[PDB]
Each structure stands twice: as structure tokens, then as C-alpha cells.
Design a protein around this nucleic acid. Structure first.
Length: 58
DNA sequence: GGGTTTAATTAGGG
DNA sequence: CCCTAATTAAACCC
């Protein structure tokens, strides 16, 4: 099973995107993908896990 | 190595 | 496709 090891860069940008919105549109997601060198799919997945984590800390 | 985090997958909702 | 909760398993880090 391949697992992505995100760089600190990818991670800080994912988090900055998340403060902006928990549910980014397609365009936001594809723009971020071009920026940080991840697929939209992996961003979507990161966002799924980020939202469940965020949810649990309430 | 093992406990914690967390990327990825599964099985469920419309 | 838009998601979820729960699970699985790999990476991080002491």
C-alpha cells in the first residue's frame, strides 16, 4: 500500500486552505493541486480526514 | 518496537 | 458525483 509522505510545504498549504474553507470547490482544489504538487484526489482525501479530525475535537 | 498520528480504503447515506 | 464514520495500515518519533 503506497502512502503519501506530505512535505511540510504541502501540509502548511493544506492547512491554510482549510482555514479558508472546510469544503473547497473543484476550482480551489485544482488550483491548490497545481500549487502544491498533489492530485486533487489526495487533497480531497486529506480534506476528508482533516474534517473528521476537526469534528472530533468538539 | 510500539504508541500516536494520519494517508488510504471500505461500506454506507443521498 | 457529493459526502460520512469506522477501519486499516503505514509513517513519525520517542
Amino acid at each position: 500500500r503506497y502512502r503519501t509522505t506530505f512535505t511540510s510545504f504541502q501540509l502548511e498549504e493544506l492547512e491554510k486552505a482549510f482555514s479558508r474553507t472546510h469544503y473547497p470547490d473543484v476550482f480551489t482544489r485544482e488550483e491548490l493541486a497545481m500549487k502544491i504538487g498533489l492530485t486533487e484526489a489526495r487533497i480531497q482525501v486529506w480534506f476528508q480526514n482533516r474534517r473528521a479530525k476537526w469534528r472530533k475535537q468538539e
